[PDB]
Design a protein around this ligand. Structure first.
Ligand code: HEM
Ligand code: HEM
Ligand SMILES: NCc1cccc(OCc2ccc3ccc(N)nc3c2)c1
Ligand SMILES: NCc1cccc(OCc2ccc3ccc(N)nc3c2)c1
Ligand SMILES: C[C@H](O)[C@H](O)[C@H]1CNc2nc(N)[nH]c(=O)c2N1
Ligand SMILES: C[C@H](O)[C@H](O)[C@H]1CNc2nc(N)[nH]c(=O)c2N1
Ligand SMILES: [Zn+2]
Lengths: 405, 404
């Protein structure tokens, strides 16, 4: 009936219509001719002003002051600023609203039930790489909270016309070195080979373990990046063991507590924050399935299966599935034992369904990327697999941005 | 222009140029992507152009484009449309057309097999009774005592102002779902509706979990008729587990033959509303979806208790553990019964080979990532890490409304 995408849950037989996609002001990669939804990364003051105006409208709606005198005055205040400087500045509460709305809008994030609970650290006064490092250490401290993890984001100064960007070169604040061997293989995390070599080129003395924490490469405006080593006591790690397989602890596997993405661009009202690292807590499949079992990551599936004495010579023994389960179980068990926040893929997806229901009421829809929301093991066992989803770009947003080298 | 398609495990890139051959709109727009939706929301020159396009594909396939036979065939098609408003395929064209439809099906992981398809021409069928005979031969052929062979039977095409030939069942072999008035469903909940239609059309129902349904067959503008399949035709596989002795006690079983019977086959503008086709099962279809889905047989918790797992909490991964053992039970049992089946790792490996073949042959391959990636152990298979482009090519299989 209604002129909006009809969305169905196939488990429950229930129907909704997404009206929120009508608010999208940016085109994704799909056309009537072909869907490109499985692609990870598919390909003027007038423009700023319209984006700025739209954000200010969003802000004044969220506080129920739409059409008010303060709303119209903030609009004139922004247009004047842009008219005289070519850019504008956010009030602090606007920044807080904006950062939360960007998380809420992130189609690939399954943890958005938590979106209203986000600690926003304003670091827009930062003026050096040393200072960026201080803000980052404080972020890690506050966010780690000795294992009782707390979502947080730290926002550094915005892109300025006629000035270089603040950038954190690492993709996360905590990552394991990846050392290329003279036989062609990689010791450590192959995902991090490039950044490891950049750190070395920049004066880092490399280790040679499988789990060496990388230093941070931090770039203040118009300067070369400076290298900073995180004090080990700030980086909480969890040694992995299995509740019944005693040999598993002997594998010497471990992972860090805090997933702190640091290379994404935060866009609010046309303003761009090139350095705004944020962190939450892990879903167990991120560590146990992707980081440890991806063939192009640590790739330990065959090793674990041999320890479990599975028939690894034939696909039909399901050895890969059996090993993957035990690895995921080890991750969950070890984090719980160490008292570090973690969420399994069942609890996470069930909570995401609650979030879809909340947002249907609050906003008439919720942009979601099915391929990213459905977990990488046990897909159809979770309720999100059976939920149709509409994907679209809303602003404020987190966006990929090219690497600074 | 042309999508750059990347495999994130191997670092390799291809470009899909085949998508430019699409003449039919999917549901996505630049404003929003609707790729995760299961079903679509909703003269003579049009038919003639689809017909010319198809005839051109056919003569190109036999390396005979431009030949006189090619030219004469286009004229035949034109003369027949101009006079009658439609036309008819030759058997060879029909065979080529059915294989291309399978090749083009973006949701099918089994397409490495596409060139090997037995095509039964049933277009000389005039009654429900004759459809039933054709269907029985199809099932006999395809089952082949456990050595399954892909096949399609094609019933007469749709015609203007005349009702369609339709098979009301969604598959030739389905288990009944009985709605006990105490809320629950006995049997397969996906089939409550069809089970009830069968009863009211005079079927004597059973009361089991795996009662094979009768076929409701409909010839144009007639009430459908009920036919019971001779039980010796329907190969079934009892499920047992290689190491869990109690598993067999559950009395679980599934049929050998996945034979979809409610999809429309479109070739060169002609539509075939009854054209059931069958291949062989991938184990996750049975183990994961049919048995473990919450709105199907839903056996997870039962199995998990038999394995003495902690059902209290999600974090013990009881569901993942029980699902793996069910999938193993299916593979084991089919292998023991000498009935063809393929596991999701073998299937997806072969699909990657298919993408490579098709990249060289046609410059691309339409693929629905959400359907190709298996429902358990997704990222443990190579397709997970493969970007894919989805689009509609003709000939094609399509969904169509239920005939009731
Ligand atoms: C609080 C607990 C959280 C959980 C359990 C969670 C979970 C996840 C997961 C599993 C993914 C997929 C990541 C991958 O496969 O690599 C993801 C993506 C994402 N998350 Fe969340 N998240 C949480 C907090 C946050 C926070 C605090 C933010 C931002 C303030 C956030 C923003 C994002 C964004 C932008 C993506 C997409 C990243 C990309 O496209 O590469 N998440 N999240
Ligand atoms: C030979 C072995 C085959 C295997 C292993 C196989 C595998 C599969 C699987 C796993 C699916 C997903 C089904 C679901 O989740 O419900 C599928 C879908 C599909 N298959 Fe294949 N298939 C085979 C043969 C065939 C044949 C012979 C045809 C047609 C001639 C075909 C056409 C299709 C179509 C049109 C779909 C999409 C169905 C839909 O949208 O509901 N397949 N296949
Ligand atoms: N796939 C590329 C790549 C490289 C490095 C990090 C990364 O992380 C994505 C991401 C972003 C935010 C997250 C928030 C919480 C969480 N548990 N995982 C999260 C994962 C993605
Ligand atoms: N998803 C709705 C629905 C209802 C009934 C049957 C069905 O089957 C889809 C389908 C189609 C073709 C197949 C070919 C081979 C196979 N193993 N499964 C196949 C499964 C799908
Ligand atoms: C090709 C495909 O899009 C790619 O492998 C995606 C699939 N789904 C994903 N889902 C999540 N959560 N994270 C990922 O990195 C990916 N990778
Ligand atoms: C909503 C979602 O698109 C739907 O559950 C899809 C997901 N992927 C699938 N994949 C296959 N092979 N079969 C299916 O029925 C589905 N269902
Ligand atoms: Zn799309």
């Amino acid at each position: 009936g209604p002129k909006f995408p009809r969305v169905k849950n196939w488990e429950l037989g229930s129907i909704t219509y997404d009206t929120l996609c009508a608010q999208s002001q940016q085109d994704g990669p799909c056309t009537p001719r072909r869907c490109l939804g499985s692609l990870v990364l598919p390909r003027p003051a007038e423009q700023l002003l319209s984006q700025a105006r739209d954000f200010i409208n969003q802000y004044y709606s969220s506080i129920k002051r739409s059409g008010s005198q303060a709303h119209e005055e903030r609009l004139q205040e922004v247009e004047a600023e842009v008219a005289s400087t070519g850019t504008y500045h956010l009030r602090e509460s606007e920044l807080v609203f904006g950062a939360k709305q960007a998380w809420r809008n992130a189609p690939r994030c399954v943890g958005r039930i938590q979106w209203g609970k986000l600690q926003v650290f304003d670091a827009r006064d930062c003026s050096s790489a040393q200072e960026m490092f201080t803000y980052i250490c404080n972020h890690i401290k506050y966010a780690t909270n000795r294992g009782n993890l707390r979502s947080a984001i730290t926002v550094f100064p915005q892109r300025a016309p006629g000035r270089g960007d603040f950038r954190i070169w690492n993709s996360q604040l905590v990552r394991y070195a990846g050392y290329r061997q003279q036989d062609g293989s990689v010791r450590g995390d192959p995902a991090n080979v490039e950044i490891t070599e950049l750190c070395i080129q920049h004066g880092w003395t490399p280790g040679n373990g499988r789990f060496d924490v990388l230093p941070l490469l931090l770039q203040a405006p118009d300067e070369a990046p400076e290298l900073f080593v995180l004090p080990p006591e700030l980086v909480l790690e969890v040694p992995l063991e299995h509740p019944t397989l005693e040999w598993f602890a002997a594998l010497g596997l471990r992972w860090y507590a805090l997933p702190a993405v640091s290379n994404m661009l935060l866009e609010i009202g046309g303003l761009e924050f090139s350095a705004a690292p944020f962190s939450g807590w892990y879903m167990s499949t991120e560590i146990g399935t992707r980081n440890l079992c991806d063939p192009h990551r640590y790739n330990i599936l065959e090793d674990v299966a041999v320890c479990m004495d599975l028939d690894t010579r034939t696909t039909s023994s399901l050895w890969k599935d059996k090993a993957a389960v035990e690895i995921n179980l080890a991750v969950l068990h070890s984090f719980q034992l160490a008292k570090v926040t973690i969420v399994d893929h069942h609890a996470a997806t069930v909570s995401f369904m609650k979030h879809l229901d909340n947002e249907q009421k609050a906003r008439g829809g919720c942009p979601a990327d099915w391929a990213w929301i459905v977990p990488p093991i046990s897909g159809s066992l979770t309720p999100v697999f059976h939920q149709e989803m509409v994907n679209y770009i809303l602003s404020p947003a987190f966006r990929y941005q090219p690497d600074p080298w």
